[PDB]
Amino acid sequence: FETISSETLHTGAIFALRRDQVRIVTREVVEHFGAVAIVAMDDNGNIPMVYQYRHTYGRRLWELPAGLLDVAGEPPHLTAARELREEVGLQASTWQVLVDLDTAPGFSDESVRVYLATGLREVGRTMGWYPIAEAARRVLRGEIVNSIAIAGVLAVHAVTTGFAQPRPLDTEWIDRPTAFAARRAER
Amino acid sequence: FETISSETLHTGAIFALRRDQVRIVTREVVEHFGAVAIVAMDDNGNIPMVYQYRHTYGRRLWELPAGLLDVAGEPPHLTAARELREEVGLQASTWQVLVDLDTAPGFSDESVRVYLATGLREVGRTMGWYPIAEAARRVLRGEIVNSIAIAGVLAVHAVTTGFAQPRPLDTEWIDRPTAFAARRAER
Numbered sequence: 001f002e003t004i005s006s007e008t009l010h011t012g013a014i015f016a017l018r019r020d021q022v023r024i025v026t027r028e029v030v031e032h033f034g035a036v037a038i039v040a041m042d043d044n045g046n047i048p049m050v051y052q053y054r055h056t057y058g059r060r061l062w063e064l065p066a067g068l069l070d071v072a073g074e075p076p077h078l079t080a081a082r083e084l085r086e087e088v089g090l091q092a093s094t095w096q097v098l099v100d101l102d103t104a105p106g107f108s109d110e111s112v113r114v115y116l117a118t119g120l121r122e123v124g125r126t127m128g129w130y131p132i133a134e135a136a137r138r139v140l141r142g143e144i145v146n147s148i149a150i151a152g153v154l155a156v157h158a159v160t161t162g163f164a165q166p167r168p169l170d171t172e173w174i175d176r177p178t179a180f181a182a183r184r185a186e187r
Numbered sequence: 188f189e190t191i192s193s194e195t196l197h198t199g200a201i202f203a204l205r206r207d208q209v210r211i212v213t214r215e216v217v218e219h220f221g222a223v224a225i226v227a228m229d230d231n232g233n234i235p236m237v238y239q240y241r242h243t244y245g246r247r248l249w250e251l252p253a254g255l256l257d258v259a260g261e262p263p264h265l266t267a268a269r270e271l272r273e274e275v276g277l278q279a280s281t282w283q284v285l286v287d288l289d290t291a292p293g294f295s296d297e298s299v300r301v302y303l304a305t306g307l308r309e310v311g312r313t314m315g316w317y318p319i320a321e322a323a324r325r326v327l328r329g330e331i332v333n334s335i336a337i338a339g340v341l342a343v344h345a346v347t348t349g350f351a352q353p354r355p356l357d358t359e360w361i362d363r364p365t366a367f368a369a370r371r372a373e374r
């Protein structure tokens with residue numbers, strides 16, 4: 001395939017809308033910053049989750065601590081470590097890559113890197129703590145629907161059961177977004 | 188919270204962009220049709236997956252058979268049964284709800300219902316067949332990143348391991364989108 005022409009329709013606060021012609025076909029893309037989420041597992045197999053209101057659905061959803069990659073030039077896991085601290089007041093000595101997910105491949109370039117933080121330390125000075133098995137059962141019961149949350153909860157669940165393994169921080173993040181950030185539409 | 192004012196910025200082919208003022212805060216929302224995906228598991232624990240090019244990432248991704256809810260008034264599982272047939276040429280006698288996922292809760296109202304189709308029959312007249320365990324290991328290895336795919340693969344993996352259970356077709360789909368379809372911006 002090949003992009004014959006790109007046309008920017010709208011630039012917003014956190015994303016930009018663009019319309020391209022391909023291969024001929026029309027493809028409207030939503031350029032996003034990209035984001036990072038954290039699955040902080042403690043010594044007893046529990047992870048913290050936040051209950052946040054999502055205007056898109058008009059209700060609160062259970063999710064993993066997460067943030068947008070809106071900090072130009074800042075390393076993803078640095079962003080992730082900051083959000084973990086600010087969201088649930090936790091510092092972690094060990095960071096690994098749990099799972100990368102492309103949220104809506106159909107119309108957006110957003111990709112989210114989910115980290116697995118361990119060696120937890122309570123620092124600083126709404127949310128709840130869930131045993132991984134429960135968080136997982138909550139997913140399968142529809143109580144956790146946020147795609148990022150589902151991916152992280154079930155991934156660490158595969159790890160906690162010995163089925164799979166975490167990964168190094170230098171693991172390549174293939175689809176990390178760059179378009180919107182490259183615009184640098186701020187001043 | 189409360190929407191003080193909604194402003195439609197752009198209506199596209201498969202989604203519409205809208206900007207609302209809330210509670211005051213600005214929230215730009217991408218109205219989507221919603222979609223359905225299928226995890227068709229055969230008598231031996233294998234599921235079919237398609238390899239499709241995603242312009243948003245400029246490469247091909249491994250995904251579950253899926254379709255947009257662009258068929259006005261058509262029941263979701265009917266849409267799902269049609270896509271399963273057209274995508275991998277399979278008919279299924281048993282349909283259950285596996286998992287619902289809200290793709291990018293941060294800026295879109297898109298929600299996807301993932302079904303678990305069993306009692307498979309090859310009908311009709313690129314894709315591949317994967318043992319659930321492998322598909323799962325592929326997710327944890329980053330070879331499967333599509334959020335819908337990750338959610339479906341790992342969910343059916345929790346079911347195949349006896350950890351969780353599928354669900355009835357009448358299971359409420361809380362976040363099923365309605366905004367864009369309610370516009371009926373076609374003729």
Ligand SMILES: Nc1ncnc2c1ncn2C1O[C@H](COP(=O)(O)CP(=O)(O)O)[C@@H](O)[C@H]1O
Pocket residue numbers: 026027028029106107200201222253254255
């Ligand atoms: N980002 C986009 N912008 C404009 N049209 C899109 C689009 N993404 C998909 N479409 C389209 O919507 C219709 C069906 O698309 P797909 O069957 O590729 C969706 P799916 O497998 O990605 O869920 C096609 O006719 C095509 O116009």
Ligand SMILES: Nc1ncnc2c1ncn2C1O[C@H](COP(=O)(O)CP(=O)(O)O)[C@@H](O)[C@H]1O
Pocket residue numbers: 013014035066067068213214215216293294
């Ligand atoms: N859909 C949207 N439209 C306009 N601004 C948005 C937005 N979604 C989030 N923002 C915002 O981006 C900044 C941080 O947002 P959040 O920390 O709520 C993101 P996250 O937990 O949803 O990943 C806020 O200053 C706010 O403007």
Ligand SMILES: [Mn+2]
Pocket residue numbers: 065066067068
């Ligand atoms: Mn956040």
Ligand SMILES: [Mn+2]
Pocket residue numbers: 252253254255
């Ligand atoms: Mn499709």
